[PDB]
Design a protein around this nucleic acid. Structure first.
Ligand SMILES: [K+]
Ligand SMILES: [K+]
Ligand SMILES: [K+]
Ligand SMILES: [K+]
Ligand SMILES: [K+]
Ligand SMILES: [Mg+2]
Ligand SMILES: [Mg+2]
Ligand SMILES: [Mg+2]
Ligand SMILES: [Mg+2]
Ligand SMILES: [Mg+2]
Ligand SMILES: [Mg+2]
Ligand SMILES: [Mg+2]
Ligand SMILES: [Mg+2]
Ligand SMILES: [Mg+2]
Ligand SMILES: [Mg+2]
Ligand SMILES: [Mg+2]
Ligand SMILES: [Mg+2]
Ligand SMILES: [Mg+2]
Ligand SMILES: [Mg+2]
Ligand SMILES: [Mg+2]
Ligand SMILES: [Mg+2]
Ligand SMILES: [Mg+2]
Ligand SMILES: [Mg+2]
Ligand SMILES: [Mg+2]
Ligand SMILES: [Mg+2]
Ligand SMILES: [Mg+2]
Ligand SMILES: [Mg+2]
Ligand SMILES: [Mg+2]
Ligand SMILES: [Mg+2]
Ligand SMILES: [Mg+2]
Ligand SMILES: [Mg+2]
Ligand SMILES: [Mg+2]
Ligand SMILES: [Mg+2]
Ligand SMILES: [Mg+2]
Ligand SMILES: [Mg+2]
Ligand SMILES: [Mg+2]
Ligand SMILES: [Mg+2]
Ligand SMILES: [Mg+2]
Ligand SMILES: [Mg+2]
Ligand SMILES: [Mg+2]
Ligand SMILES: [Mg+2]
Ligand SMILES: [Mg+2]
Ligand SMILES: [Mg+2]
Ligand SMILES: [Mg+2]
Ligand SMILES: [Mg+2]
Ligand SMILES: [Mg+2]
Ligand SMILES: [Mg+2]
Ligand SMILES: [Mg+2]
Lengths: 97, 93, 51, 50
RNA sequence: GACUCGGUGAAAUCAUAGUACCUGUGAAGAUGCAGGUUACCCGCGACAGGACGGAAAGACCCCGUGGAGCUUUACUGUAGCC
RNA sequence: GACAAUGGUAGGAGAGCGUUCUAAGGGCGUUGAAGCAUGAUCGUAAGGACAUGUGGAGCGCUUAGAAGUGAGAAUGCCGGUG
RNA sequence: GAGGGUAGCGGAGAAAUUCCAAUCGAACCUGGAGAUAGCUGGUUCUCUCCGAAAUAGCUUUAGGGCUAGCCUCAAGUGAUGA
RNA sequence: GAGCUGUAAGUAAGCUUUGAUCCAGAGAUUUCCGAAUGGGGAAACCCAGCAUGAGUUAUGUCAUGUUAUCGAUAUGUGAAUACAUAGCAUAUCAGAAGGCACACCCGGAGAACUGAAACAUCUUAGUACCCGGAGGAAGAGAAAGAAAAUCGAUUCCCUUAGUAGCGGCGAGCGAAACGGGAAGAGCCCAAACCAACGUUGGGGUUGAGGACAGAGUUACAAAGGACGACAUUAGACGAAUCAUCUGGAAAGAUGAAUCAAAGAAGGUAAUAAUCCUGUAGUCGAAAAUGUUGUCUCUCUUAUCCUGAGUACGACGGAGCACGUGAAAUUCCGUCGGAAUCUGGGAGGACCAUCUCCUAAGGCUAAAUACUCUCUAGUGACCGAUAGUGAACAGUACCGUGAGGGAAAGGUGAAAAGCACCCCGGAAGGGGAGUGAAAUAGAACCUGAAACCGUGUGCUUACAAGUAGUCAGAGCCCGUUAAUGGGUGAUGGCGUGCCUUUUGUAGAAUGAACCGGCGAGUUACGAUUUGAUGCAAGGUU
């Protein structure tokens, strides 16, 4: 309340809408992928078990922050272009599942 | 456990160590009246009359028929009827 | 180690003595006591559970 | 009779009732004719007029 | 009635009070501050100038986006009538 | 040890006093507890002791915990008495 | 005079806002209920350090409020202050 | 298992070991009013009719039974009116009535102050109040569901989440599904079609099924028995301490012992594990209520149909978190009004496809809600202005009435409650006695302050004052022994406190005085800081 002056949240306009079908992913970066040893197959179940991912959300997306330094077979729902390129260029492989 | 006519010893009060016969009992007050114990010296308006006043029953104790020692009271069921037995010796009262 | 009824019944009337089990240990009881008398099995269980 | 609201253009509300369309009709109850109040919907959805 | 004596015996009020006047000062009208002036201690009958005396959180006046009764071609409704 | 600072309303910050209850520890008490009264006592303050008298059965201290925790004003409420 | 009747969004009124159980522009009792009160009053121990404002803007706003200004506490920066 | 005739004294008369008073179960009696019910009535009263029976020559009077209204059942009399019906009598039954803690629950009906800094939509709130109906719970409940990989009745708890959304898009209002838990349970009809007289039995109960071609009195059907066991409603047993000291009294102090499945707690002349009542433990029921078992006991082994004035629609409303909105879903009034497994409904307007389901019949325990009650217990809850309004009361008192509504606890361990003497009519005192103590003497523990008195060490009748403070002789005392205490001639300075104000000695506010009571609290969220634990993890 501003003593009768029009409040800020009445003088400003409403904006946008909420998407009812919005998808949000649990994100894993390459520096988090460093935790596993070479040759390991990474799955959402493995990620939740080892504790990297706490809540699965709409799926698991691999992102390209940090440096991987390991050779892994990463099975996830989504990969960023940089994450896929780094996984493939470190000797490993990735698959969208 | 204390009954009229019983021989008791006073174990607390001015008359501690005295012995005397139980004149009367008062179960609602948990008190007893003992001969020669707790004289009161009341002013009577028809002189000064000396009479015993009641004392709390827990201030007197039964005496053992064998060793004469003051004893607490237990119970047994001799011939069906409940009977009193001294805790000191084990003999009936 | 566990609920020992005869030990508990023997000890429960002495002033200042208190009897508990391994799982029953608590800070109030332990700190209030001046000494702990523990059986070997109870001590092993305490080590096992508190790690 | 049911109860609800009369609403104005400004949406002011006052309590009001909705009454059944009762019509006094000669009806055979228990095998003996009598004039009872029965709704028109009930009459269309065959009491039994005598 | 008041007044004196015998009997009985309230009340409103009340920050504590050993409670003067003048001219001044001051929230601009002072028992209580200044400078003077006057005044031995304690009652009783009287008078009403002051204690902005007592009494009732001013009725006047204004203010509150207070209340209530009343009016109408104020607004929105509505019993009822067509 | 030698320099500096320390008027204060609304208000911010800090440190403490005291009251009742609880826990643990350690104590006092019919050879007289609490309470009450008096005194020429002690601490920078809130406040703390001691002695005597009264009283006649409960009560301090330490640390921590918890609050119905401190009254002089509300034309406050009740009681007592002017 | 006796026995009765009319009841508060109502009665009654030879009409005065008149009467309805000692105050009627809408009786009394209980409840919603601790209505609401931007108003008045009140708000209880101590010491220590700092210490304002009575202005601007907007406000059915003008003895209210909000943001800024001015106070305080704590972290930072560091010459940017006088 | 010895006292007893309530509280409750006091005498009087009695009762009780041939078992009283008392306690528990079961019976008997149970005046009148009150729904109140034979009629009336200003409750606790008045007046009656029938039948039976005392009594009286007879009447008067008396005792028992019965007689309300609306209802059921079945016998008559029976209108206008032919028959009948309505109506009127009788006989039998006893179904309803009224009350509550009616707290919790379901339903009908339903505000306003208030918030929105005005106010009307909205909010307060489907709340208060009123009315009706019940139960130990009620309500809901066995998918025309949730959904989008599938689940599988209902309810409640956590979370989702102050999210999605609703909203003069203001103030505010505000889900659900998923997931995690408590609990867990499923069934009966209508209809197709058979056999007996449309009504009865069989048939059947669904997401495709049906027709056709061992279970139970807790729903699922309803009555008993036999016996057992357990529980409640009285009770019983139950270990162990003596001495001295101070004291009126010992449980306290000291010494030396003892018991403990008992060191809970009360009481006892001060503070007791061993004095008492008890406690740990153990035992106990003639009778009545309950719970629960085994045996018994019975019950049982797509031709057709599938809920019609329905679903649904229009209008007007309401309930859904959702204010008519793109508003699905549910309900009411008015009016219209389908289809029939090649069917019907839902998946948030609607269409199509797909997916799920199968309305218009009913029943159903448990997990949940509450406390006037009862039993057993608990408290960093009160301790007589507190705690219930009420420790001795819905009383006294106030009001026509609805209704409002207090004040008031404490002798002592034991009444030992003051024999007797003296003044006094008494009241009240002084002695003497009781008592540890009477300034513990009932108006009784302690006994503060205001306030009222008596005595007097210093001082005061020439003095102008917020009463003190600083200086200071004189006089009187002598301490928590301190460069002391009381008083005070005289001199200097000096207009109370609070509140509210630019500014108050203010002639602005408030307080007669004293005492008690009397105001930032708690819950759930947010944020920030300090502390602590762990750390790419932390935490339920
Ligand atoms: K500000
Ligand atoms: K209801
Ligand atoms: K307002
Ligand atoms: K049939
Ligand atoms: K509609
Ligand atoms: Mg004259
Ligand atoms: Mg006179
Ligand atoms: Mg001045
Ligand atoms: Mg002037
Ligand atoms: Mg003057
Ligand atoms: Mg002067
Ligand atoms: Mg005079
Ligand atoms: Mg005046
Ligand atoms: Mg005024
Ligand atoms: Mg200075
Ligand atoms: Mg200062
Ligand atoms: Mg502060
Ligand atoms: Mg502090
Ligand atoms: Mg303190
Ligand atoms: Mg307080
Ligand atoms: Mg006052
Ligand atoms: Mg008038
Ligand atoms: Mg006029
Ligand atoms: Mg008139
Ligand atoms: Mg009048
Ligand atoms: Mg309200
Ligand atoms: Mg109020
Ligand atoms: Mg300063
Ligand atoms: Mg009658
Ligand atoms: Mg009647
Ligand atoms: Mg009831
Ligand atoms: Mg408003
Ligand atoms: Mg014993
Ligand atoms: Mg539909
Ligand atoms: Mg169907
Ligand atoms: Mg008292
Ligand atoms: Mg009281
Ligand atoms: Mg005394
Ligand atoms: Mg006294
Ligand atoms: Mg002189
Ligand atoms: Mg002179
Ligand atoms: Mg002066
Ligand atoms: Mg002014
Ligand atoms: Mg004055
Ligand atoms: Mg004023
Ligand atoms: Mg005044
Ligand atoms: Mg006062
Ligand atoms: Mg606050």
């Amino acid at each position: 309340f501003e003593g009768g002056q029009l409040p800020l949240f009445r003088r400003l306009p409403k904006r946008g809408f909420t998407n009812i079908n919005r998808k949000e992913y649990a994100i894993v970066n390459l520096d988090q992928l460093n935790k596993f040893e070479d040759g390991t197959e990474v799955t959402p179940a493995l990620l939740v078990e080892s504790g990297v991912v706490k809540n699965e959300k709409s799926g698991i997306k691999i992102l390209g922050n940090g440096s991987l330094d390991k050779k892994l077979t990463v099975k996830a729902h989504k990969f960023s272009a940089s994450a896929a390129e780094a996984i493939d260029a470190k000797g490993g492989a990735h698959e969208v599942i | 456990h204390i009954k009229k006519g019983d021989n008791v010893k006073v174990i607390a009060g001015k008359d501690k160590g005295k012995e005397g016969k139980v004149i009367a009992t008062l179960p609602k007050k948990d008190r007893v009246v003992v001969e020669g114990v707790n004289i009161m010296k009341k002013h009577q308006k028809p002189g000064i009359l000396e009479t015993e006043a009641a004392i709390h029953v827990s201030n007197v104790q039964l005496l053992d028929p064998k060793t004469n020692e003051p004893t607490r009271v237990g119970y047994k069921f001799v011939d069906g009827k409940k009977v009193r037995i001294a805790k000191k010796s084990g003999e009936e009262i | 180690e566990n609920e020992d009824v005869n030990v508990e019944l023997s000890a429960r009337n002495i002033p200042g003595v208190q009897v508990t089990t391994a799982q029953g240990l608590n800070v109030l009881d332990i700190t209030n006591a001046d000494s702990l008398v523990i059986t070997e099995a109870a001590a092993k269980k305490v080590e096992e559970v508190l790690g | 009779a049911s109860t609800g609201n009369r609403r104005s253009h400004a949406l002011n509300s006052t309590k009001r009732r909705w009454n059944a369309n009762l019509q006094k009709v000669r009806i055979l109850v228990d095998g003996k004719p009598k004039k009872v109040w029965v709704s028109a919907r009930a009459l269309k959805s065959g009491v039994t007029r005598v």
